[PDB]
Amino acid sequence: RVLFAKKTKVEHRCTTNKLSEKHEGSFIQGAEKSISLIRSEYGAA
Amino acid sequence: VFSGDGKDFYRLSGNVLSYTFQVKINNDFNYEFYNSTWSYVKHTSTEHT
Ligand SMILES: *[C@@H]1O[C@H](CO)[C@@H](O[C@@H]2O[C@H](CO)[C@@H](O)[C@H](O)[C@H]2NC(C)=O)[C@H](O)[C@H]1NC(C)=O
Numbered sequence: 550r551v552l553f554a555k556k557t558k559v560e561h562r563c564t565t566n567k568l569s570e571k572h573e574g575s576f577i578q579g580a581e582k583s584i585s586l587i588r589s590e591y592g593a594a
Numbered sequence: 595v596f597s598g599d600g601k602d603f604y605r606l607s608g609n610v611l612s613y614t615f616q617v618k619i620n621n622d623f624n625y626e627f628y629n630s631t632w633s634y635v636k637h638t639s640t641e642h643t
Pocket of ligand 1: 627629
């Protein structure tokens, strides 16, 4: 401002950004096989 | 024929050539176990003023 007049200017700007990603991995597996031969019928137990 | 894995006595025949009392038995086991899993998570956010 100078004689005679008045000027005023205001400017405001803000930004915000956020990102989140999560991934988890877990797995289990197992196999078991077997064979046999055995030479009364009570032994079949 | 004497007592083999059974009662007191059995009776054979002329046509039958043999009766045997030998024990043999076979067994097998093939076990398989599987278990898969999946877990995916995604998130996004955007704000502007
Ligand atoms: C499936 O996955 C599970 C892993 O959690 C395997 O076995 C589990 O073992 C725990 C041990 O304490 C027990 O409490 C669970 O109850 C079991 N799972 C189930 C579903 O009973 C299991 O071997 C895998 N495969 C299958 C179930 O076929």
